[PDB]
Short mmCIF file of C-alpha atoms in Angstrom, two decimals:
data_model
loop_
_atom_site.label_atom_id
_atom_site.label_comp_id
_atom_site.label_asym_id
_atom_site.label_seq_id
_atom_site.Cartn_x
_atom_site.Cartn_y
_atom_site.Cartn_z
CA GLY A 19 -26.34 12.37 2.65
CA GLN A 20 -29.45 10.20 2.94
CA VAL A 21 -31.31 9.10 -0.21
CA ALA A 22 -34.79 7.69 -0.64
CA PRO A 23 -35.18 3.98 -1.50
CA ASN A 24 -35.85 4.66 -5.18
CA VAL A 25 -32.51 6.50 -5.40
CA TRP A 26 -30.60 3.84 -3.43
CA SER A 27 -31.80 1.11 -5.84
CA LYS A 28 -30.12 2.95 -8.75
CA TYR A 29 -26.76 2.50 -6.99
CA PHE A 30 -27.24 -1.00 -5.67
CA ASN A 31 -29.12 -4.06 -6.79
CA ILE A 32 -32.03 -4.29 -4.35
CA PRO A 33 -32.69 -6.50 -2.24
CA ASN A 34 -29.10 -6.95 -1.04
CA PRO A 35 -28.96 -8.79 2.29
CA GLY A 36 -25.16 -9.00 2.24
CA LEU A 37 -24.77 -5.28 1.63
CA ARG A 38 -27.25 -4.52 4.42
CA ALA A 39 -25.24 -6.66 6.82
CA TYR A 40 -21.99 -5.13 5.60
CA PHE A 41 -23.17 -1.61 6.44
CA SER A 42 -24.58 -2.73 9.78
CA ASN A 43 -21.07 -3.88 10.71
CA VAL A 44 -19.75 -0.55 9.43
CA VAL A 45 -22.11 1.27 11.80
CA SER A 46 -21.38 -0.85 14.87
CA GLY A 47 -17.63 -1.27 14.37
CA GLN A 48 -15.55 -4.23 15.48
CA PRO A 49 -14.06 -3.70 18.96
CA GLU A 50 -12.20 -6.94 19.75
CA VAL A 51 -8.40 -7.24 19.65
CA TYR A 52 -7.44 -10.40 17.71
CA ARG A 53 -4.44 -12.14 19.32
CA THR A 54 -2.75 -15.07 17.54
CA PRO A 55 -1.51 -18.21 19.37
CA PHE A 56 2.04 -16.89 19.00
CA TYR A 57 3.63 -17.12 22.43
CA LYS A 58 0.21 -17.95 23.87
CA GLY A 59 0.22 -17.15 27.58
CA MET A 60 2.72 -14.32 27.42
CA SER A 61 1.58 -10.74 26.86
CA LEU A 62 2.61 -8.60 23.90
CA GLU A 63 4.75 -6.59 26.36
CA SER A 64 6.84 -9.52 27.56
CA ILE A 65 7.32 -10.90 24.03
CA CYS A 66 8.90 -7.62 22.90
CA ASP A 67 10.76 -7.18 26.20
CA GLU A 68 12.37 -10.59 25.82
CA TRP A 69 13.34 -10.17 22.16
CA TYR A 70 14.78 -6.73 22.99
CA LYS A 71 17.33 -8.29 25.37
CA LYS A 72 18.83 -10.06 22.36
CA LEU A 73 18.26 -7.20 19.91
CA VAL A 74 20.36 -4.60 21.76
CA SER A 75 23.51 -6.42 20.78
CA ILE A 76 23.32 -4.72 17.33
CA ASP A 77 23.34 -1.26 18.94
CA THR A 78 27.11 -0.84 19.02
CA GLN A 79 27.70 -1.84 15.39
CA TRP A 80 24.43 -0.47 13.89
CA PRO A 81 23.01 2.20 16.22
CA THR A 82 20.68 3.75 13.61
CA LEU A 83 19.21 0.29 12.99
CA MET A 84 18.52 0.13 16.73
CA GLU A 85 16.85 3.55 16.42
CA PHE A 86 14.72 2.25 13.57
CA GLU A 87 13.72 -0.80 15.65
CA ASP A 88 12.95 1.41 18.68
CA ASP A 89 10.83 3.72 16.56
CA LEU A 90 8.75 0.85 15.11
CA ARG A 91 8.35 -0.89 18.48
CA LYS A 92 6.39 2.16 19.65
CA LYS A 93 3.76 1.24 17.03
CA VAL A 94 3.36 -2.42 17.96
CA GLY A 95 -0.10 -3.37 19.08
CA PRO A 96 -3.58 -4.26 17.83
CA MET A 97 -4.62 -3.87 14.24
CA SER A 98 -8.10 -5.39 14.37
CA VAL A 99 -10.04 -2.68 16.25
CA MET A 100 -12.50 -1.01 13.83
CA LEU A 101 -14.12 2.11 15.23
CA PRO A 102 -17.85 2.67 14.63
CA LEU A 103 -18.74 4.73 11.59
CA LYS A 104 -19.75 7.68 13.77
CA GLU A 105 -16.13 7.89 14.98
CA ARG A 106 -14.71 7.83 11.43
CA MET A 107 -16.73 10.69 9.93
CA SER A 108 -13.79 13.05 10.21
CA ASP A 109 -11.55 10.53 8.40
CA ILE A 110 -13.99 10.76 5.50
CA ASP A 111 -14.08 14.58 5.67
CA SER A 112 -10.31 14.71 5.18
CA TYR A 113 -10.69 13.33 1.66
CA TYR A 114 -12.92 16.29 0.71
CA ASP A 115 -11.37 19.07 2.87
CA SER A 116 -7.67 18.40 2.34
CA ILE A 117 -7.74 19.09 -1.41
CA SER A 118 -8.41 22.83 -1.03
CA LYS A 119 -5.26 23.78 0.89
CA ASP A 120 -3.07 26.47 -0.67
CA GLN A 121 -1.34 24.94 -3.69
CA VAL A 122 0.84 26.20 -6.56
CA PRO A 123 1.45 24.33 -9.84
CA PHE A 124 4.38 22.10 -10.59
CA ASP A 125 7.38 23.38 -12.50
CA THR A 126 7.39 22.64 -16.23
CA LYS A 127 11.01 21.44 -16.23
CA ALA A 128 10.20 18.88 -13.51
CA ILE A 129 7.32 17.49 -15.60
CA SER A 130 9.67 17.24 -18.61
CA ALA A 131 12.48 15.58 -16.62
CA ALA A 132 9.99 12.93 -15.50
CA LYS A 133 8.81 12.37 -19.05
CA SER A 134 12.52 12.03 -20.08
CA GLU A 135 12.90 8.92 -17.91
CA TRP A 136 10.77 6.98 -20.36
CA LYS A 137 12.01 8.56 -23.60
CA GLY A 138 12.29 5.52 -25.78
CA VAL A 139 9.38 3.56 -24.38
CA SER A 140 6.66 1.79 -26.34
CA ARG A 141 3.53 3.88 -25.87
CA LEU A 142 0.75 2.20 -23.94
CA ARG A 143 -2.41 0.90 -25.57
CA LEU A 144 -5.52 0.04 -23.59
CA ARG A 145 -5.96 -3.64 -22.88
CA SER A 146 -9.38 -5.00 -23.89
CA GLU A 147 -12.15 -5.37 -21.32
CA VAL A 148 -11.96 -9.14 -21.67
CA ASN A 149 -8.20 -9.47 -21.13
CA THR A 150 -8.27 -6.94 -18.29
CA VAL A 151 -10.97 -8.98 -16.53
CA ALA A 152 -9.00 -12.24 -16.95
CA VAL A 153 -5.91 -10.80 -15.19
CA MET A 154 -7.58 -9.08 -12.24
CA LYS A 155 -8.42 -10.62 -8.87
CA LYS A 156 -11.87 -12.02 -9.36
CA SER A 157 -12.68 -13.30 -5.86
CA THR A 158 -12.96 -9.82 -4.40
CA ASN A 159 -16.14 -7.82 -4.00
CA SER A 160 -17.70 -6.20 -7.08
CA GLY A 161 -18.84 -3.08 -5.20
CA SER A 162 -21.76 -1.22 -6.65
CA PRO A 163 -24.16 -2.32 -7.78
CA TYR A 164 -24.10 -6.04 -6.94
CA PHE A 165 -21.72 -6.23 -3.93
CA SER A 166 -20.89 -9.84 -4.90
CA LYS A 167 -17.89 -11.84 -6.05
CA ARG A 168 -16.48 -10.39 -9.25
CA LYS A 169 -16.57 -13.75 -11.03
CA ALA A 170 -20.32 -14.11 -10.53
CA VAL A 171 -21.27 -10.81 -12.19
CA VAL A 172 -18.78 -10.46 -15.05
CA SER A 173 -21.59 -10.99 -17.57
CA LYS A 174 -23.85 -8.42 -15.86
CA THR A 175 -20.94 -5.97 -15.88
CA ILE A 176 -19.20 -6.04 -19.29
CA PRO A 177 -19.26 -4.58 -21.88
CA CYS A 178 -19.27 -1.44 -19.73
CA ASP A 179 -18.79 2.30 -19.91
CA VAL A 180 -18.23 4.72 -17.01
CA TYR A 181 -17.92 8.51 -16.76
CA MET A 182 -18.73 11.50 -14.57
CA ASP A 183 -21.83 13.59 -15.32
CA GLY A 184 -21.46 16.41 -12.84
CA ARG A 185 -21.40 14.86 -9.41
CA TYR A 186 -22.81 11.46 -10.56
CA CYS A 187 -20.81 8.49 -11.83
CA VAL A 188 -22.80 7.07 -14.75
CA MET A 189 -22.21 3.37 -15.43
CA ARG A 190 -23.56 1.38 -18.40
CA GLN A 191 -23.12 -2.39 -17.83
CA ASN A 192 -24.18 -4.87 -20.55
CA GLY A 193 -27.04 -2.59 -21.60
CA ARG A 194 -28.24 -1.38 -18.15
CA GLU A 195 -27.42 1.98 -16.53
CA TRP A 196 -26.54 2.15 -12.85
CA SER A 197 -25.28 5.02 -10.74
CA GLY A 198 -21.81 4.39 -9.32
CA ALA A 199 -20.48 4.90 -5.81
CA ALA A 200 -17.48 3.62 -3.90
CA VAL A 201 -18.40 1.64 -0.78
CA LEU A 202 -16.69 2.71 2.45
CA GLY A 203 -14.20 0.01 3.41
CA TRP A 204 -11.70 -0.20 6.26
CA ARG A 205 -8.19 -1.37 7.12
CA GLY A 206 -6.48 -1.35 10.50
CA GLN A 207 -2.85 -0.34 10.86
CA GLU A 208 -0.99 -0.75 14.18
CA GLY A 209 -0.21 2.55 15.85
CA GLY A 210 0.50 1.74 19.47
CA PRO A 211 -0.25 -0.94 22.09
CA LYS A 212 -3.77 0.18 23.13
CA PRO A 213 -6.99 -0.86 21.32
CA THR A 214 -7.58 2.87 20.69
CA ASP A 215 -4.24 3.28 18.90
CA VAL A 216 -5.31 1.35 15.79
CA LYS A 217 -5.11 3.58 12.74
CA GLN A 218 -8.46 3.66 10.96
CA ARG A 219 -7.71 3.57 7.25
CA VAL A 220 -10.46 4.64 4.82
CA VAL A 221 -10.70 2.24 1.86
CA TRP A 222 -12.75 3.22 -1.22
CA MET A 223 -14.11 0.02 -2.72
CA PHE A 224 -14.76 0.84 -6.33
CA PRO A 225 -17.48 -0.45 -8.64
CA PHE A 226 -16.26 -3.42 -10.67
CA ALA A 227 -16.94 -1.53 -13.93
CA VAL A 228 -14.85 1.43 -12.81
CA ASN A 229 -11.96 -0.87 -11.85
CA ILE A 230 -12.14 -2.67 -15.20
CA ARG A 231 -11.97 0.57 -17.18
CA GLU A 232 -9.17 1.92 -14.96
CA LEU A 233 -7.11 -1.26 -15.16
CA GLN A 234 -7.33 -1.30 -18.96
CA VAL A 235 -4.63 1.37 -18.74
CA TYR A 236 -3.00 0.60 -15.38
CA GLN A 237 -2.35 -3.10 -16.06
CA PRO A 238 -0.34 -2.32 -19.25
CA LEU A 239 1.32 0.60 -17.44
CA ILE A 240 2.54 -1.52 -14.50
CA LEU A 241 3.73 -4.27 -16.87
CA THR A 242 5.79 -1.87 -18.99
CA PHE A 243 7.37 -0.07 -16.02
CA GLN A 244 8.20 -3.41 -14.38
CA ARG A 245 10.10 -4.63 -17.44
CA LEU A 246 11.89 -1.31 -17.80
CA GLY A 247 12.74 -1.14 -14.08
CA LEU A 248 11.50 2.46 -13.75
CA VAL A 249 9.81 1.88 -10.35
CA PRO A 250 11.88 -0.80 -8.54
CA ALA A 251 9.25 -1.40 -5.85
CA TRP A 252 6.85 -2.62 -8.57
CA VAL A 253 9.42 -5.33 -9.41
CA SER A 254 10.77 -6.66 -6.08
CA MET A 255 12.52 -5.69 -2.86
CA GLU A 256 15.77 -6.87 -4.44
CA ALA A 257 15.26 -4.32 -7.23
CA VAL A 258 14.69 -1.69 -4.54
CA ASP A 259 17.92 -2.83 -2.85
CA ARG A 260 19.93 -2.53 -6.05
CA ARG A 261 18.84 1.06 -6.69
CA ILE A 262 19.43 1.99 -3.03
CA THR A 263 22.97 0.71 -3.61
CA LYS A 264 23.41 2.75 -6.81
CA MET A 265 22.10 5.79 -4.94
CA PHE A 266 24.63 5.45 -2.10
CA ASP A 267 27.45 4.78 -4.58
CA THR A 268 26.66 7.77 -6.84
CA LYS A 269 25.68 10.47 -4.34
CA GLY A 270 27.95 13.34 -3.42
CA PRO A 271 30.36 12.12 -0.74
CA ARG A 272 29.11 14.82 1.63
CA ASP A 273 25.45 14.95 0.53
CA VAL A 274 22.65 13.73 2.78
CA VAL A 275 19.96 11.28 1.72
CA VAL A 276 16.44 12.58 2.57
CA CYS A 277 13.58 10.22 3.51
CA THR A 278 10.24 11.93 3.03
CA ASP A 279 6.89 10.99 4.46
CA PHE A 280 3.50 12.54 3.68
CA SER A 281 0.74 12.72 6.27
CA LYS A 282 -2.49 11.64 4.54
CA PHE A 283 -1.10 11.72 1.00
CA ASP A 284 -4.27 10.31 -0.58
CA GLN A 285 -6.37 13.02 1.02
CA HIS A 286 -4.11 15.81 -0.24
CA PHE A 287 -3.80 14.51 -3.83
CA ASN A 288 -5.63 17.56 -5.06
CA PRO A 289 -6.54 18.74 -8.60
CA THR A 290 -3.07 20.30 -9.07
CA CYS A 291 -1.54 16.85 -8.44
CA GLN A 292 -4.23 15.16 -10.60
CA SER A 293 -3.53 17.21 -13.74
CA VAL A 294 0.16 16.37 -13.46
CA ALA A 295 -0.84 12.69 -13.40
CA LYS A 296 -3.13 13.16 -16.39
CA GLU A 297 -0.40 14.88 -18.39
CA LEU A 298 2.19 12.13 -17.68
CA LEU A 299 -0.25 9.34 -18.57
CA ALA A 300 -1.10 11.18 -21.79
CA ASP A 301 2.59 11.08 -22.72
CA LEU A 302 2.71 7.31 -22.04
CA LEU A 303 -0.54 6.55 -23.86
CA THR A 304 -1.34 6.53 -27.57
CA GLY A 305 -4.51 6.37 -29.66
CA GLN A 306 -8.03 7.73 -29.61
CA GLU A 307 -9.39 5.36 -26.94
CA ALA A 308 -6.67 6.66 -24.58
CA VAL A 309 -7.79 10.25 -25.17
CA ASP A 310 -11.30 9.06 -24.36
CA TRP A 311 -10.01 7.26 -21.25
CA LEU A 312 -8.12 10.34 -19.99
CA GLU A 313 -11.27 12.51 -20.20
CA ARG A 314 -13.89 10.04 -18.83
CA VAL A 315 -12.26 7.23 -16.79
CA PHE A 316 -9.21 8.96 -15.28
CA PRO A 317 -11.15 11.57 -13.20
CA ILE A 318 -13.53 9.10 -11.56
CA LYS A 319 -11.14 8.13 -8.77
CA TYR A 320 -10.99 11.77 -7.62
CA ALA A 321 -14.74 12.47 -7.81
CA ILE A 322 -16.74 9.22 -7.44
CA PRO A 323 -19.53 9.30 -4.80
CA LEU A 324 -19.04 7.48 -1.50
CA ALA A 325 -21.68 5.14 -0.09
CA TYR A 326 -20.69 5.31 3.60
CA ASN A 327 -23.89 3.82 5.08
CA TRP A 328 -26.96 1.97 3.87
CA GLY A 329 -29.02 5.01 3.11
CA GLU A 330 -26.27 7.52 2.63
CA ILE A 331 -24.10 8.82 -0.20
CA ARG A 332 -21.55 11.66 -0.23
CA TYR A 333 -20.83 13.67 -3.42
CA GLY A 334 -18.12 16.06 -4.59
CA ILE A 335 -14.52 16.01 -5.71
CA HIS A 336 -12.01 14.61 -3.23
CA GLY A 337 -8.49 13.37 -2.81
CA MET A 338 -7.15 10.09 -4.17
CA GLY A 339 -9.84 7.55 -3.64
CA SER A 340 -7.67 5.17 -1.55
CA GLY A 341 -8.35 1.87 -3.24
CA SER A 342 -8.55 2.77 -6.90
CA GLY A 343 -6.90 0.55 -9.51
CA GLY A 344 -4.59 3.48 -10.26
CA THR A 345 -4.04 4.44 -6.63
CA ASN A 346 -0.31 3.82 -6.71
CA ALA A 347 0.31 4.57 -10.39
CA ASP A 348 -1.01 8.16 -10.35
CA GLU A 349 0.65 8.97 -7.05
CA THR A 350 4.00 7.40 -7.92
CA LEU A 351 4.28 9.21 -11.28
CA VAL A 352 3.52 12.56 -9.60
CA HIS A 353 5.70 11.92 -6.55
CA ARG A 354 8.55 11.42 -9.03
CA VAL A 355 7.83 14.85 -10.52
CA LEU A 356 8.09 16.25 -6.99
CA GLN A 357 11.57 14.74 -6.57
CA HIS A 358 12.77 16.28 -9.86
CA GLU A 359 11.19 19.63 -8.98
CA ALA A 360 13.13 19.81 -5.71
CA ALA A 361 16.52 19.37 -7.42
CA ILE A 362 15.55 21.74 -10.25
CA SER A 363 14.36 24.48 -7.89
CA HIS A 364 17.97 24.38 -6.64
CA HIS A 365 19.76 24.42 -9.98
CA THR A 366 20.82 20.79 -10.07
CA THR A 367 19.70 17.36 -11.27
CA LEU A 368 17.92 14.62 -9.33
CA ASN A 369 20.05 11.58 -8.63
CA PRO A 370 18.09 9.12 -10.81
CA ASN A 371 18.64 6.37 -8.21
CA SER A 372 16.29 8.20 -5.88
CA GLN A 373 13.07 6.20 -5.39
CA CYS A 374 9.43 6.78 -4.59
CA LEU A 375 6.22 4.77 -4.24
CA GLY A 376 2.90 6.39 -3.35
CA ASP A 377 3.46 8.39 -0.17
CA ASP A 378 7.02 7.09 0.56
CA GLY A 379 10.24 8.40 -0.95
CA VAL A 380 14.00 8.56 -0.59
CA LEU A 381 16.11 10.95 -2.69
CA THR A 382 19.38 12.85 -2.99
CA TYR A 383 20.90 15.56 -5.20
CA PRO A 384 23.95 17.87 -4.88
CA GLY A 385 23.30 20.21 -1.98
CA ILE A 386 20.01 18.65 -0.90
CA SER A 387 18.54 19.52 2.49
CA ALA A 388 15.34 18.28 4.11
CA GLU A 389 14.08 21.83 4.58
CA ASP A 390 14.43 22.56 0.87
CA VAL A 391 12.55 19.35 0.04
CA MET A 392 9.73 19.99 2.47
CA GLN A 393 9.22 23.53 1.14
CA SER A 394 9.43 22.36 -2.48
CA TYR A 395 6.86 19.56 -1.92
CA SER A 396 4.38 21.22 0.42
CA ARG A 397 3.71 24.36 -1.70
CA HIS A 398 1.47 22.04 -3.74
CA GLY A 399 -1.03 21.60 -0.90
CA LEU A 400 0.74 18.52 0.52
CA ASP A 401 0.97 17.99 4.27
CA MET A 402 4.26 16.83 5.80
CA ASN A 403 5.35 16.49 9.44
CA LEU A 404 9.05 16.99 10.15
CA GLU A 405 9.53 14.43 12.94
CA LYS A 406 8.58 11.80 10.36
CA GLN A 407 11.25 13.06 7.92
CA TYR A 408 14.73 11.54 8.17
CA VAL A 409 18.16 12.76 7.04
CA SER A 410 21.55 11.01 7.00
CA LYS A 411 24.64 10.57 4.83
CA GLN A 412 25.00 6.85 5.54
CA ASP A 413 21.57 5.25 5.92
CA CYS A 414 17.89 5.64 5.05
CA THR A 415 14.50 4.04 5.47
CA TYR A 416 12.08 3.24 2.69
CA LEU A 417 9.04 0.93 2.48
CA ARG A 418 9.55 0.31 6.23
CA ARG A 419 13.05 -1.06 5.69
CA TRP A 420 16.40 0.23 6.93
CA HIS A 421 19.34 0.46 4.53
CA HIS A 422 22.91 1.50 5.26
CA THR A 423 25.72 2.32 2.84
CA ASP A 424 28.00 -0.09 4.73
CA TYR A 425 25.43 -2.84 5.40
CA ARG A 426 26.00 -4.99 2.33
CA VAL A 427 25.06 -8.57 1.45
CA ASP A 428 26.79 -9.72 -1.74
CA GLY A 429 27.60 -6.15 -2.68
CA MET A 430 24.08 -4.81 -2.19
CA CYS A 431 22.69 -2.36 0.41
CA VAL A 432 19.90 -4.74 1.36
CA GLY A 433 16.86 -3.57 3.30
CA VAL A 434 16.32 -4.60 6.89
CA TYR A 435 12.72 -5.01 8.00
CA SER A 436 12.11 -4.46 11.72
CA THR A 437 12.10 -7.49 14.03
CA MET A 438 9.93 -5.51 16.46
CA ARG A 439 7.40 -4.72 13.76
CA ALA A 440 7.44 -8.38 12.68
CA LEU A 441 6.90 -9.56 16.27
CA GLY A 442 3.88 -7.27 16.60
CA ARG A 443 2.35 -8.82 13.48
CA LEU A 444 3.12 -12.34 14.63
CA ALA A 445 1.24 -11.67 17.89
CA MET A 446 -1.56 -9.46 16.42
CA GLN A 447 -3.79 -9.98 13.38
CA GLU A 448 -6.35 -7.77 11.69
CA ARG A 449 -8.91 -10.59 11.34
CA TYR A 450 -10.15 -13.50 13.40
CA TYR A 451 -9.36 -17.03 12.21
CA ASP A 452 -11.09 -19.50 14.51
CA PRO A 453 -8.53 -22.26 15.28
CA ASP A 454 -11.24 -24.93 14.97
CA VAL A 455 -12.15 -23.96 11.37
CA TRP A 456 -8.85 -22.89 9.70
CA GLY A 457 -6.21 -25.11 11.35
CA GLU A 458 -2.54 -24.71 12.18
CA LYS A 459 -1.12 -24.89 8.65
CA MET A 460 -2.70 -21.56 7.68
CA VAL A 461 -1.56 -19.79 10.86
CA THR A 462 1.96 -21.16 10.28
CA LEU A 463 1.96 -19.86 6.71
CA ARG A 464 0.94 -16.41 7.88
CA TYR A 465 3.87 -16.53 10.35
CA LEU A 466 6.39 -17.55 7.69
CA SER A 467 5.37 -14.76 5.31
CA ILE A 468 5.86 -12.18 8.07
CA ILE A 469 9.22 -13.50 9.25
CA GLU A 470 10.43 -13.62 5.65
CA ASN A 471 10.63 -9.80 5.72
CA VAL A 472 13.61 -9.89 8.10
CA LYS A 473 15.66 -12.06 5.75
CA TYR A 474 18.52 -9.50 5.72
CA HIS A 475 18.49 -8.52 9.38
CA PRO A 476 21.86 -9.01 11.13
CA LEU A 477 20.07 -10.92 13.93
CA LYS A 478 17.77 -12.91 11.65
CA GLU A 479 18.97 -16.33 12.82
CA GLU A 480 18.51 -15.48 16.49
CA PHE A 481 15.15 -13.92 15.63
CA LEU A 482 13.96 -17.08 13.86
CA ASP A 483 14.96 -19.18 16.89
CA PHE A 484 13.02 -16.81 19.12
CA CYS A 485 9.97 -17.17 16.83
CA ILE A 486 10.24 -20.97 16.67
CA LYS A 487 9.68 -20.82 20.40
CA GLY A 488 6.32 -19.27 20.72
CA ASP A 489 4.95 -21.56 18.01
CA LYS A 490 3.67 -24.86 19.44
CA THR A 491 4.54 -26.71 16.23
CA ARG A 492 7.68 -24.62 15.68
CA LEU A 493 6.99 -22.79 12.40
CA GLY A 494 6.20 -26.08 10.67
CA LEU A 495 9.01 -28.30 12.02
CA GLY A 496 6.42 -29.91 14.32
CA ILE A 497 3.79 -30.53 11.61
CA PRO A 498 4.37 -33.97 9.99
CA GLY A 499 5.24 -33.53 6.31
CA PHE A 500 4.55 -29.78 6.18
CA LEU A 501 8.01 -28.54 5.31
CA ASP A 502 8.47 -31.22 2.63
CA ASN A 503 5.15 -30.16 1.01
CA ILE A 504 5.49 -26.42 1.65
CA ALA A 505 4.79 -25.51 -2.01
CA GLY A 506 1.51 -27.41 -2.02
CA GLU A 507 0.47 -26.20 1.41
CA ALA A 508 1.18 -22.66 0.23
CA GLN A 509 -1.26 -23.07 -2.67
CA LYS A 510 -4.13 -24.14 -0.43
CA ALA A 511 -3.35 -20.93 1.48
CA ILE A 512 -4.31 -18.55 -1.36
CA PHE A 513 1.86 -7.15 -0.74
CA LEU A 514 3.54 -6.41 -4.12
CA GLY A 515 0.20 -6.61 -5.97
CA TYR A 516 -0.78 -3.93 -3.45
CA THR A 517 2.16 -1.58 -4.13
CA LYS A 518 1.26 -1.65 -7.82
CA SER A 519 -2.53 -1.08 -7.74
CA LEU A 520 -4.97 -0.73 -4.92
CA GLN A 521 -3.22 0.47 -1.65
CA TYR A 522 -5.22 -1.75 0.86
CA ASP A 523 -2.52 -3.91 2.61
CA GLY A 524 0.28 -1.66 3.91
CA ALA A 525 3.42 -18.55 -5.14
CA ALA A 526 5.37 -21.82 -4.61
CA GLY A 527 8.32 -19.46 -4.76
CA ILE A 528 7.85 -20.02 -1.02
CA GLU A 529 10.39 -22.83 -1.34
CA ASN A 530 13.05 -20.20 -2.08
CA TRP A 531 12.15 -18.00 0.91
CA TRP A 532 15.02 -17.54 3.32
CA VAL A 533 12.81 -18.55 6.27
CA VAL A 534 11.93 -21.89 4.68
CA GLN A 535 15.56 -22.73 3.86
CA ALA A 536 16.48 -21.63 7.36
CA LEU A 537 13.89 -23.91 8.96
CA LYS A 538 14.90 -26.89 6.81
CA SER A 539 18.49 -26.42 7.84
CA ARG A 540 17.34 -26.57 11.49
CA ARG A 541 16.10 -30.13 11.12
#
């Protein structure tokens, strides 16, 4: 745990007033519930109770959509309540304790079937440090050692080299050696209506130099898979929709579709899972630098130290460091092996229109059952809870959207985001934006980007009308000139970038959003 000052200064550039104040907020927590001005003067309860009166009209035509809405309404509530560090210690422990559950290795044929999906593909080369830096988000925090904006410390960071030496992460940055540690970050996820129901997500904020080295492989990997369409959720929700359609149209007429969920996937992504990820990357990669990368950069996300408080560092191997540049790449490649393994364990072939993304999957194969899947997956040390699994021949959920074989828009089984979930996010934010300092245009833009998720909901027009009420300036209709200049307003403002890399949140194309078109047509 606690290190003397002369140790701490090898991890972080000292003095660091901003890092001191960051950890002070980590210790004390953040207890206030942040409510938006959406339906100001009505409670969260009445907002949902009123929308529900309209919503129930879908229950006769689409009862399982009503069940999906009713399940997500139970989660509506605050997302801004950050517990004090002393109440999150067990959340940290789970990263280190969950990786030693009983676990057996993956089947060879499953690993080969996964590698077959990219048979003809141009092998990946590492992207240079310089080009990798240019592409990445550079306004976000550099982590250890500077805890600054990335753009300000590029030249103190590259050229860099990072590797594990035992339990230490050694980092050489433009000639100087530092010791690397992830900084304990936080995200809130709604999990009920009380302040104490906020889910306390553990975010590992990686050293800039580690993220650069990681992304030298993961940026080319994401790019290649996007163009090949291998992981639809890295492309778009419409690409997800098209593969959901293919899945429903090619499954056995009497087969179920199984929707799997992992409890604490990152924490259980143990060494057995890691070596499958390393093997698959090695098949995608080519050249000597890649061999070097696979031995020295790849392991860091599963073993980097954690700075969880100003004087305090935890060491040891652990599960997926939630927040790594390859957070979703490693897990999605291995989750795909799990899907193949389940069909192969039962003497059949995975329906290739099955999908997965980090801890979320939907699959089918001849004769599939949920119980076979759960057994096949969880023998690898992976935790699953049944009442979060879902099984049906006609519908499924994936990436918090409902899909039905018969619910088609222009031929496609489009995904229906929950109006209840969207209402919770319209009323409740994770951060405070003082009205006096950020203004109504930004709040309105946050609203539009939430509502846009329900663009395929059968009650989307009634839902938009409901949301127009509840906004004083009516989602932009009441702001002079705003809708006519929506592209430009949207650029002053500045989830898919998330699904591809980091896993924290769980561009003038805004003019093509359904919700914008729908508002303009209401003038």
